[model samples]
Target: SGFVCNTCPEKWINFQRKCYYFGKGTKQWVHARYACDDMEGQLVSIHSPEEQDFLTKHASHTGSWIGLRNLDLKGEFIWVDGSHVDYSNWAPGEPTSRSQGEDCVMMRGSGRWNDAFCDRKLGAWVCDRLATCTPPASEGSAE
Candidate 1:
């Protein structure tokens, strides 16, 4: 009767055809990365203001780890998926110098971004992946 599309797993929130998992447990940046990998996804990457707003609303108020960092101390922020850092919502005076080992990125409840120490254990994190969709099942149905 109507079009059927793919959906997210239980407890996962779907937005714009993407699935997002907000981790409730606290973990360091590296641990969060591995946890997301275990879910067959990567740390959530914000590509636009709307996406950022969506995540900001659901993200933990304390802090949530994002898929961005400069672990190599190269002075360049990189996403876990190797995508370009085109859209950013960094807070004022954020992304501090490399001298303090502040290489990991996090999103505050206010939707502002900040660079913190990679080893710092954050309150939460986000993982994202494209929704798995298949062709319409009725296409090849025989009468």
Candidate 2:
């Protein structure tokens, strides 16, 4: 049997044991969630600085949407998967909610995060899936 490769699935990049699909185009936060759902994933829910650093390092210069929002409660953030917000890295003066309707979260220039209006802002997004084991060879074939 030929050796099998165990890594992130096609079209995904691996880091910190997670598979990420950096979207190619822009979409508003709500629609972005739909896009990620189609990929069997969700907007990236950053848990630590290292993970955030990796995302920012490989992200598009224009910025991208992440899995962070306070949509239901404008001042309280939560992950798409319902995880508590234990860590955060916001740019200075960000989450500014500078205006009244800002509720969703986005990774702005560099790795800093900022809160903005979900439907009002459009940008690329990052999707994440936990890595799974690759299937084993069926056997009987050497090629």
Candidate 3:
């Protein structure tokens, strides 16, 4: 019934055909992942510098969880979509874990990244998904 176009849901931020939702609630990494899943999205995945920059500009001051994690294989971070990490923005001396169980990744307000425990609660989280496309309504009336 609407015009044909690619669009994001109201209140979500759009960038490069993707929609992002920044949640303000503090939640554990797994809990945050579930939250995003409940909204039909996955934790935000950064694949490029531009994407990272966009997220940094809108990220929360208290930091937020992203989709990257090394839960399955220590030190081998992967995105929620099952993609291998190709780009990163880790802060100095980060991803250290130091055998402290740091497996989840968070984006700081300054746009830098750090590894944290999966059970550790953060200030916020980000979710991302492809924009939905709606086809135009039929031009002619149907019999």
Candidate 4:
């Protein structure tokens, strides 16, 4: 049995095997993350530089909220989806100037990751969810 169509939610784009949603409004990291949670997803967690580039090309010009944050340990980055952060593309000397309470992460227009404060509403955010392949009907329906 296989899916008759891509089971991603409305307005979401499918990439590689995942579904992504690019929101139109800008919200704080927490708000944005929750917004995605409300939609049954979480903020985007880039698995590799290639995925980062994919999101970079599709994100807003002002930057986009990513799921990376160190709110718990103060310096250890973790993804909202509970996956270990094995790959990263942080810009030069980022997560530094650690003052001003920068904790959340964002992706710049140049496809580089940057650390920013969680409360600051800087740009639109991207949400991601694993695509679910569900059968809608019998495999060989004639009508």
* Best model number under lDDT: 4
Q: Which pairs clash in the backbone of model 2?
A: none
- Candidate 2 TM-score, true structure as reference: 0.72
- lDDT (Cα, tens digit) per residue for candidate 3, span 1-143: 65434444443576666688776775677776887887688988777666666666667566667888785535788887788787767675554545567677777767667666676656776777666754566876675
Looking at model 1, the pairs that clash are none
Q: What TM-score do all the candidates reach, one by one?
A: 0.72, 0.72, 0.73, 0.73
Please write out the lDDT profile of model 1 over residues 47-107, one tens digit for every residue: 7677666666667555666788775643678888887588766675544555556677777
Q: What lDDT does model 1 reach?
A: 0.69
Task: Report the C-alpha lDDT of model 4 over 30-140, residue by residue, as the tens digit.
Answer: 777887877677788877787777777777566777888775545778887766578766675555655666677778778777766676656676788766654576677
Q: How close is candidate 3 to the true structure, as a TM-score?
A: 0.73
Name every residue pair that clashes in candidate 4: none
User: Total backbone clashes of model 4?
Assistant: 0
The sequence of per-residue lDDT tens digits that candidate 2 reaches over residues 30-115 is 67677778777888877777777666666655566678777464678877778757786666554453566656777765766766
lDDT of each candidate versus the true structure: 0.69, 0.68, 0.70, 0.71
Consecutive 10-residue window with the lowest summed lDDT within model 1: 2-11
Quote the lDDT for 88 in model 4. 69
Per-residue lDDT for 119 in model 4?
67
Q: With candidate 2 superimposed using the best TM-score fit, by how many Å does residue 90's alpha carbon deviate from the native?
A: 3.0
